[PDB]
């Protein structure tokens, strides 16, 4: 398909990252994304998958960290047929999604050491994670990683095997810090404001006060998009009817009065 870069970073670093992504898109190898909390890494990975030659069939961004147990993540990687009884969902579907597709995960540091070893064994062979009483199926699948934690830090911790870290890390995508980016931050903020003014169907766009924009820039805003969207929603809830430029930030539910 075609990569979607709506509200792409105006910073030249974002453009260089996009150029590297375009270069690697014809290739078929794992990628590591050094991101931050709400930095936009997974959206960048999805855009790369869109640009990754064909549409690459199914695209799944399941995160092992946001799972009840590591056993559930292993079942998602591969479900042995007849093992245990019952399930919350068809576990083999997650494995089948990578078939004719790529592998995308978020916060891979939380993955169990046994799970990491099983994944490393699968990646080299390509076979299905769970045999289920039969020979595992080698599905043609790519891979992508996105963890804020440093891979060398994990190697020092020893949670990930040396082979796992090496073969897993084929491409590195270092997401620029949200606080560090200023021009890209302003461009993205303007794009988000326009998109909100359109979606919220407000008759007139309030715009943005210079003091309000300066205060927003002064905020650390680690969530390049997540915190940005949260602050946009906080300002939208305090709807000024296109006449109040205060842009009060009510994103923090704990904050009151």
């Amino acid at each position: 398909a075609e990569y979607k870069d709506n509200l792409l970073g105006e910073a030249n670093s974002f453009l260089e990252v996009l150029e590297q992504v375009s270069h690697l898109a014809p290739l078929d190898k794992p990628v590591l994304i050094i991101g931050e909390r709400g930095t936009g890494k997974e959206l960048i990975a999805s855009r790369l998958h869109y640009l990754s030659s064909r549409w690459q069939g199914p695209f799944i961004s399941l995160n092992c960290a946001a799972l009840n147990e590591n056993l559930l993540d292993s079942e998602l990687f591969g479900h042995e047929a007849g093992a245990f009884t019952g399930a919350q969902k068809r576990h083999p579907g997650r494995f089948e999604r990578a078939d004719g597709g790529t592998l995308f995960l978020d916060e891979l540091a939380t993955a169990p050491m046994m799970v990491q070893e099983k994944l490393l064994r699968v990646i080299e062979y390509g076979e299905l994670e769970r045999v289920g009483g039969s020979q595992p199926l080698q599905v043609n699948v790519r891979l992508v990683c996105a963890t804020n934690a440093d891979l060398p830090a994990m190697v020092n911790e020893g949670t990930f095997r040396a082979d796992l870290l090496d073969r897993l890390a084929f491409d590195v995508v270092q997401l620029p810090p949200l606080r560090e980016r200023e021009s890209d931050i302003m461009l993205m903020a303007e794009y988000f404001a326009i998109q909100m003014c359109r979606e919220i169907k407000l008759p007139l766009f309030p715009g943005f006060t210079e003091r309000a924009r300066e205060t927003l820039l002064n905020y650390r805003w680690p969530g390049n998009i997540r915190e940005l969207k949260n602050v946009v929603e906080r300002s939208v809830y305090r709807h000024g009817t296109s006449d109040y430029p205060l842009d009060d930030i009510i994103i923090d539910p704990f904050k009151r009065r």
């Binding site: 064909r54 549409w55 690459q56 069939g57 004719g100």
Partner: protein, 190 residues
Amino acid sequence: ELNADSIPRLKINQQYAAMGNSARNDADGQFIRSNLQEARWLIKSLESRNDTLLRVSRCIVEQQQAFFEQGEEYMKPMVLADIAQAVEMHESTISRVTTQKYLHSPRGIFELKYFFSSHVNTEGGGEASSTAIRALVKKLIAAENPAKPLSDSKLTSMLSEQGIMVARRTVAKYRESLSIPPSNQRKQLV
């Protein structure tokens, strides 16, 4: 929706049930009870079969809407297991349902089994229905210069321009299915 006229319906004989319930003879009453049990089982089986067929048809249409609306070219490559996954019944029940069943739609009258088609690898990663591939091949072959008929290798290259991923042997088989003549035979004086 199932054709109301075509679907058979059975009704329990109320007079017979009343006679059997109040039957003076114990043997006659037992025979009536056995017959009533058998008839109830048969009626329940018929109703369940009709309902299962309706549900299977609805599930099949859910995935074949593209072919239903756009036409034969936009036919998704689907298998029996694909339909079995969307329902709780097994592929055996799918085969039993997809047995001598014809459904009428705005497009026309088509057999239930005609929906299922082979999966063909294609450029862009997707898979295509072999029926749709044959339909496209026939459409291309018909719209050709009569003086110079298209070669099967040439047709294969043309479809590869759309991402055939075929070696023209399957194209040859499809042409045989459509009774396409040879490139030498197809050509004629202008």
